[model samples]
Target: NLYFQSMRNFSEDVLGWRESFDLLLSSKNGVAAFHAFLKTEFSEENLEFWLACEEFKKIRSATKLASRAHQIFEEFICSEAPKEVNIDHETRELTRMNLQTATATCFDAAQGKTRTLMEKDSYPRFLKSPAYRDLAAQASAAS
Candidate 1:
């Protein structure tokens, strides 16, 4: 039953991603899978932006926080950024304003918006993707 067990484990790993976007973000494996899927869709910037914000939130140094805040803004928030996310103009402006202080919460609004976009858009598609469905199918087969 080692083969069955392996398949079951794979199924559970894939099913875990379906449980919640937060769960997917929590698991490095899930994040990599999701990032791969997003790249196929040409929208990996959302995840990249989200990951940058997560890292940005952890900086304890004031100077580092300030520099990283601007970096994140320029890389993912500013118009014509190489990897700009799809947040609304209002949220983008708010994030720009937040940069004036450059606190840990500076990217909160933009991050939330990007996260919501992924949850509402990319996440569902990910669940339905052949990559996910094929792995999820292993659950039933294993059972």
Candidate 2:
């Protein structure tokens, strides 16, 4: 339904951003620069890079990403409704409340539709520890 659509859109955006960030962070040139910086003992260039990261870090937190994506997802989902959803002299407001009980709160939920697709075909890289293993076994047994 609309919720699934929203989840798909959000998952796409997260995947794109994650890829972009990783590409930059994992570049050959990027690694070369990091190695140079290490040899130079944190030169001005390296310091500037660190400072830039700190500055960008403030803006790129999970909370900010969630808020921005939530707005886009809400708009996309709302627009899919028919024209009578509005312009019908509709004094009625289509109350669109954002349910924040999703991935913004948990990485698992945040990467929902995309990560779930991977889960279907592959094992999670970050498997649970013994405590969680016990739970998983219990859940499987119960099922």
Give one clash count per candidate, in the order shown: 0, 2
**Candidate 1 clashing pairs?**
none
What TM-score against the true fold does each predicted structure earn?
0.87, 0.20
What overall lDDT goes with each candidate model?
A: 0.89, 0.34
lDDT of 1 at 131: 86
The candidate that wins on TM-score is 1
> At residue 115, what lDDT does model 2 achieve?
29
Candidate 2 local lDDT, 75-136, one digit each (tens)? 32244532111111121222223335323322222223322332332122212234334434
Candidate 2 residue-wise lDDT at 91? 17
What lDDT score goes with residue 35 in model 2?
37
Which digits, one per residue and each the tens of the lDDT, describe model 1 over residues 1-143? 89877777766666778888888898787899999999999999999999999988999998999999999999999999999988789999998998888999999899898999999999999999998888677755665
Least accurate stretch of 10 residues (summed lDDT) in model 2?
83-92
